[PDB]
């Protein structure tokens, strides 16, 4: 998946990336990268599902429906995935980059928030911060929803 994203970036930098219907060139590039990384996360999760033994206690709690979903198994075992804020990949908070550790105009997977590790393997510090950025949205939305729906 990372190599495919790199190839998509090469095509975009070469102006070889064809704008898909409706979308623009930059928007179609973002859609391409998101599509590739969604495929990566979903495929890795699916491969994780079939590897679980019958006695696996995550599976017992997911197939029963009591607590959890197959996406939680995917994130715990295989890969966490893409962290979005406001529906887009992590934005360029600094000048043309997401953190001081990355290089200007770097749209690669890990440069824009794609968490490639699992919660068992632990998160690299950059993607730890990106995961915190992604997770803050849930708290903000909860705090505003509570007050907006009661009225």
Partner 1 sequence: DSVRLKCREMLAAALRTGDDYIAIGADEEELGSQIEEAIYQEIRNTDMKYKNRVRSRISNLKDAKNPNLRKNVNIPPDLFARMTAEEMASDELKEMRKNLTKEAIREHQMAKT
Partner 2 sequence: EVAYCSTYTHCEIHPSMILGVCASIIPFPDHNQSPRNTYQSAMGKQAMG
Partner 3 sequence: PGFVGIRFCQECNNMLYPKEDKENRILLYACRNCDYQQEADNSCIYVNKITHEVDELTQIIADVSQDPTLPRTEDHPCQKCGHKEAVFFQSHSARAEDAMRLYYVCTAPHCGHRWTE
Residues that bind partner 2 (CB under 8 A): 100-101, 103, 119-120, 122-125, 128-129, 131-132, 134-136, 138-139
The position carrying tokens 């898909």 is: 20
Structure tokens at 114: 């794609």
| d(C-alpha 67, C-alpha 64), whole Å | 8
Q: Which of 24, 16, 138 is nearest to 83 (CA)?
A: 138
Binding of residue 2 to partner 3 (CB under 8 A)? no
Cβ 102 to partner 3 shortest distance, Å = 9
Binding of residue 38 to partner 1 (CB under 8 A)? no
Give the start-end residues of each E strand in 16-128. 81-82, 114-115
| d(C-alpha 40, C-alpha 133), whole Å | 21
24-43 positions binding partner 3, by CB under 8 A: 24-26, 29
Binding of residue 138 to partner 1 (CB under 8 A)? no
Binding of residue 19 to partner 3 (CB under 8 A)? yes
Binding of residue 87 to partner 1 (CB under 8 A)? no
Q: Is 139 in a helix, a strand, or coil?
A: helix
Binding of residue 21 to partner 1 (CB under 8 A)? yes
Contact residues: partner 3, CB under 8 A: 12-13, 15, 17, 19, 24-26, 29, 96-97, 100, 103-106
């Amino acid at each position: 998946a990372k190599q495919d994203v790199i190839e998509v970036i090469e095509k975009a930098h070469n102006n070889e990336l064809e704008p898909t219907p409706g979308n623009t060139l930059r928007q179609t590039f973002e859609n391409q990268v998101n599509r590739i990384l969604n495929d990566a996360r979903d495929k890795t999760g699916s491969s994780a599902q079939k590897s679980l033994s019958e006695y696996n206690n995550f599976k017992s709690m997911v197939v029963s429906g009591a607590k959890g979903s197959k996406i939680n198994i995917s994130q715990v075992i295989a890969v966490v995935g893409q962290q979005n804020v406001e529906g887009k990949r992590i934005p360029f908070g600094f000048k043309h980059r997401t953190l001081p550790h990355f290089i200007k105009d770097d749209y690669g997977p890990e440069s824009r928030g794609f968490v490639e590790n699992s919660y068992l393997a632990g998160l690299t510090p950059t993607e730890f911060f990106f995961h915190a950025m992604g997770g803050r949205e849930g708290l903000i939305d909860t705090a505003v929803k509570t007050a907006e729906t009661g009225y």
